[PDB]
Amino acid sequence: SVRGANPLMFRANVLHMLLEFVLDNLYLNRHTGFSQDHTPFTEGANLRS
Amino acid sequence: LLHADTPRLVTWDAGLCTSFKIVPIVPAQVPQDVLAYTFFTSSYAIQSP
Numbered sequence: 001s002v003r004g005a006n007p008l009m010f011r012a013n014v015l016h017m018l019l020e021f022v023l024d025n026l027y028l029n030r031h032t033g034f035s036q037d038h039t040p041f042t043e044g045a046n047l048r049s
Numbered sequence: 050l051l052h053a054d055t056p057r058l059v060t061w062d063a064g065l066c067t068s069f070k071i072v073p074i075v076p077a078q079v080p081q082d083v084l085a086y087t088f089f090t091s092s093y094a095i096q097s098p
Binding site for chain 1: 081082083084085086087088089092
């Protein structure tokens, strides 16, 4: 059947999925600039743009 | 008519009362953490003196 997976291959599949979840997130967080905000609610904060 | 070669004493200046101006000799552009001021959805740029 097109729709439907095989339960005995669940853990096997799930594990692989978690693997890609990690691989796809292997990056360094780049520092971009900010802006000094003066909206009443976040008065004087430096929001990252 | 008023023929007399009369001098102009009274004169006005609506501008700035300065006679010296600061100029750039060697330009330059450097990276900054803050890029502008933000208010709600609006954003104003930074103008230095």
